[PDB]
Enzyme design. Structure first.
Site, mmCIF file in Angstrom:
data_model
loop_
_atom_site.group_PDB
_atom_site.id
_atom_site.type_symbol
_atom_site.label_atom_id
_atom_site.label_comp_id
_atom_site.label_asym_id
_atom_site.label_seq_id
_atom_site.Cartn_x
_atom_site.Cartn_y
_atom_site.Cartn_z
ATOM 1 N N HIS A 75 -19.482 22.818 3.120
ATOM 2 C CA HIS A 75 -19.811 24.095 3.524
ATOM 3 C C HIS A 75 -18.824 25.231 3.310
ATOM 4 O O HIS A 75 -19.189 26.181 3.015
ATOM 5 C CB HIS A 75 -20.401 24.040 4.818
ATOM 6 C CG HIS A 75 -21.800 23.394 5.125
ATOM 7 N ND1 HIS A 75 -22.831 23.518 4.371
ATOM 8 C CD2 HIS A 75 -22.179 22.481 5.975
ATOM 9 C CE1 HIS A 75 -23.745 22.689 4.690
ATOM 10 N NE2 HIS A 75 -23.343 22.126 5.785
ATOM 11 N N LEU A 132 -21.949 45.091 -8.799
ATOM 12 C CA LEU A 132 -22.809 44.193 -8.646
ATOM 13 C C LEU A 132 -23.463 44.087 -7.464
ATOM 14 O O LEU A 132 -22.818 44.529 -6.406
ATOM 15 C CB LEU A 132 -22.109 42.926 -9.042
ATOM 16 C CG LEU A 132 -23.140 41.536 -8.742
ATOM 17 C CD1 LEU A 132 -22.842 40.783 -10.122
ATOM 18 C CD2 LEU A 132 -22.995 40.952 -7.491
ATOM 19 N N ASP A 188 -26.755 24.461 -4.296
ATOM 20 C CA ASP A 188 -26.963 23.180 -3.603
ATOM 21 C C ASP A 188 -25.762 22.375 -3.937
ATOM 22 O O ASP A 188 -25.024 22.660 -5.178
ATOM 23 C CB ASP A 188 -28.399 22.641 -3.932
ATOM 24 C CG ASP A 188 -28.728 21.492 -3.051
ATOM 25 O OD1 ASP A 188 -28.178 21.222 -2.055
ATOM 26 O OD2 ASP A 188 -29.475 20.842 -3.885
#
Lengths: 220, 220
Positions: free
Chosen positions: B28, B118, B11
């Site tokens: 963004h 990962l 966020d």
């Protein structure tokens, strides 16, 4: 603006006692008195609902002696809240509890159900997994009995079947310093503001509550 | 000890742009590059799984223009992660997404599925309610088809049916200063440690991650 519904993880009663070299019963004994105090302060501020976590489905893993002490102490519910003017409900799996505690709970709910001030929901032998599982079992039973189809399974259906209901907590306060929800109201906390304090539950007062509410209000 | 699975609420991308008087697309645009960086740092520290919240089921309520921009930007997934050596999975409702994004997701998963470093799980058109609802629908379908009985409904069954699976997040990091889970991995966060930072996602670096991990380790 003032939170309508506060969720409370009343952690730190153990710790409080252990830190002082006292036995854990000394910490636990603060539970209902402190919760009563918090209810009194909260209804004066206009808070309408408190859901308080008294005993987790995972707390059965504590020492047998401790668990037995807690289950006996919980029978003081009636004496503590019956004449408080608070409306009391218990959520959690009541039928796993001792019958005398089940009767104490049933009586406390019956005698306070007419009260129209603050509503206290005590989560006793409760967990988020449990709440979602029991709600799912009821949904499946309804499906098996032709009462709904799979595509009728939506958020509103779950809100009807869950034990902790709308309106959901606006704010959650957890005392004792850990920053987890610890299998509390998992579904119901989706948009709840979290407030964590290192302050142990027996030391948590009006000024600690006010500060949490103020912190909540300044996030708006 | 090092968290195996970190959950990330990314966020602050909006805000970061707005605070500077730039349009929201500028914020963004940091999403995937910053997430890539976080994946690189995280696999060096030995972290095995990251579940990152890229688009909520509630984010469809943003301005159409913004939503359309995001859905197009998300197609950069392939170019960003295909050659990264990260294994990529998407969770969320893929069939509500544009077909070209669905193909981009399917290709990115296919080409990275053999990678053994990962594992990055990107929650795109995801929500906790959604995950629990879809898992419940599958459970009901199995019951309707005689594959299980109501009393077989337990935590392990849900863990098999949910999109975000065991092992669950050890730690959740949310950037941007709000202290909510905002309908992220509700079931899966039952015992997760929460870490909140005011730092906006585009400003979140190695030192911010290390500090969160250290904060996590000192709670043990």
């Amino acid at each position: 603006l003032m939170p309508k519904h506060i969720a409370l993880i009343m952690d730190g009663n153990r710790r409080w006692a252990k830190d002082k070299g006292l036995d854990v019963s000394e910490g636990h004994k603060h539970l209902f008195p402190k919760l009563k105090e918090i209810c009194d302060i909260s209804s004066k501020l206009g808070i309408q609902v408190i859901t308080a976590f008294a005993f987790s489905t995972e707390n059965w893993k504590r020492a047998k002696g401790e668990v037995d002490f807690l289950m006996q102490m919980f029978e003081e519910l009636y004496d503590e809240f019956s004449r408080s003017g608070v409306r009391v409900s218990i959520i959690g799996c009541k039928t796993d509890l001792p019958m005398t505690l089940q009767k104490c709970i049933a009586l406390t709910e019956e005698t306070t159900k007419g009260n129209k001030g603050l509503h206290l929901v005590i989560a006793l032998n409760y967990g988020g997994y449990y709440d979602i599982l029991q709600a799912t079992k009821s949904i499946v039973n309804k499906a098996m009995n032709g009462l709904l189809d799979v595509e009728d399974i939506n958020k509103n259906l779950f809100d009807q079947e869950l034990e902790s209901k709308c309106p959901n907590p606006d704010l959650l306060i957890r005392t004792g310093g850990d920053q987890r929800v610890s299998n509390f109201l998992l579904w119901q906390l989706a948009y709840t503001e979290f407030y964590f304090t290192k302050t142990l539950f027996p030391d948590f007062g009006e000024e600690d509550l006010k500060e949490a509410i103020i912190n909540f209000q300044q996030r708006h």
